[PDB]
Amino acid sequence: SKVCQVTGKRPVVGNNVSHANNKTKRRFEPNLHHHRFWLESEKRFVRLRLTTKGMRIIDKLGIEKVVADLRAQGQKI
Amino acid sequence: MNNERIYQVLKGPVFSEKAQVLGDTAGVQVFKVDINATKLEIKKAVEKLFGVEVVKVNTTITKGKTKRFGRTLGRRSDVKKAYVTLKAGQD
Amino acid sequence: AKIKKGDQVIVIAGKEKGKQGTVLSVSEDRVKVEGLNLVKKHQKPNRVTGAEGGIVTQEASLHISNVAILNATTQKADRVGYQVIDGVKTRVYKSTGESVAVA
Amino acid sequence: MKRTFQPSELKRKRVHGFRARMATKAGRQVLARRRAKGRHSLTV
């Protein structure tokens, strides 16, 4: 399903609101996509399904820290 | 085979005109047997408990009747019969 | 306040009130007393066993509360209590406290 | 004339049978409702 591995983001529900104030159900979806990251400590590429905010967090903290954190939550990377 | 099953296989004789004629003329004994008894089981049981020689065993199953006794409907159990042919002159 | 199979009782209620006899059986809350409360059964003949029928007289049970044990010394109705004499429980007459006489 | 009910035991069991009901969650809910109502017979 559409879940970001780094942040846990998922689609949420909301409304389309028209000019006459008609309200209809809608969904907001994350900016999800697949990306390969080079893990040097393991000499391999890891493929993650994540968002652009996930990429920003990886840029901030390093891929090793993020991968260790995700493993600590029971994610089989 | 164990003696427990050996003593449990055979239930009793059959008393009817057909059974009597078969016993009188053909050297055939008709038994009521356990519903799950096999032909080999019946052969071994008869041979052990009567000291005769069995040529062959024929088995048939008759489904129980459903009758309205009083105000309630009841059903009888299925009965398996065994035709046991003895060798030459026995029993 | 038990009534047992061999006691001597006197009827205190019903059409047999005032008569006495030996109890023949106690079952549930009903008691049969020999010679008392007789009914006439019109027995049909039995085809299988022969034994042609007829009008027979037999005892019918009364309610257990309709009889009382008879005190042999006083010839009066009485109630029953229990006393632990020695180590055994024993029935006694409430009027005089004597042990119930085995018949 | 040909009427609507044309019996067939195999089709009856494969469509409405115990294992067919057990195969889906809606069928298991059907069995739960019939058990709660106390039906003497659960399935065909």
Binding site: - | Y7, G12, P13 | - | -
Partner: protein
């Protein structure tokens, strides 16, 4: 009869079980043929078998 069975050992109990089962078969056959007037012996044997099995599992 329970005490009498109880003093016996395992081997004697296992033998008595076979004798009682054979006797049960004989009694059933006699009742089926109709040459058995007294009928309580089938119940006695049926209870004796159960008592023997109970004592066997108790001792083992």
């Amino acid at each position: 009869k329970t005490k009498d069975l109880r003093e016996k050992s395992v081997e004697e109990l296992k033998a008595l079980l076979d004798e009682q089962q054979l006797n049960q078969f004989r009694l059933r056959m006699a009742k089926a043929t109709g040459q058995l007037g007294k009928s309580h012996e089938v119940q006695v044997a049926r209870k004796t078998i159960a008592r023997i099995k109970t004592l066997l599992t108790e001792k083992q």
